[PDB]
């Protein structure tokens, strides 16, 4: 058997929906200057 995650998920015990060790960091996105209007943050 496994331990920690993939064991709480198997047994239904409280655990994050997404494995923290497998959570990819979200890449950098448009910085309100590579983006058109209507998608920029209102500042």
Partner 1 sequence: TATSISLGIDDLLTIPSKGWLVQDAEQQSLILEKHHHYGNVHAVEKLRQ
Partner 2 sequence: DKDTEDEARRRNWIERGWAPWEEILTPEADFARKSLNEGEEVPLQSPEAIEAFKMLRPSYRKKKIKEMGITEDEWYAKQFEIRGDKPPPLDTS
Partner 3 sequence: VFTGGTAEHVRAPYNGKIKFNEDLVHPTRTRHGHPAFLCYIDLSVIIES
Q: Contact residues for partner 2 (CB under 8 A)?
A: 33-37
What would the two tokens of residue 43 be?
A: 């500042």
Q: Which of 27/43 has CB closer to partner 1?
A: 43
The one of partner 2, partner 1, partner 3, none whose footprint includes residue 34, by CB under 5 to 8 A per kind, is partner 2
Q: Give dist(CA 9, CA 11) in Å, integer.
A: 6
- Chain residues binding partner 1 by CB under 8 A are 37-38, 42
Interaction between residue 36 and partner 3 (CB under 8 A)? yes
Q: Output DSSP code: residue 42.
A: -
Rounded to a whole number of angstroms, the minimum distance from the CB of residue 32 to partner 2 is 9
Query: If DSSP codes are grouped into helix, strand and coil, which group holds residue 33?
Result: coil
What would the two tokens of residue 35 be?
A: 């983006």
């Amino acid at each position: 058997e496994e331990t920690g995650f993939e064991l709480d998920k198997k047994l239904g015990r409280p655990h994050p929906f997404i494995d923290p060790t497998k959570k990819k960091q979200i890449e950098t996105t448009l910085t309100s200057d590579e983006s058109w209007w209507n998608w920029r943050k209102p500042e």
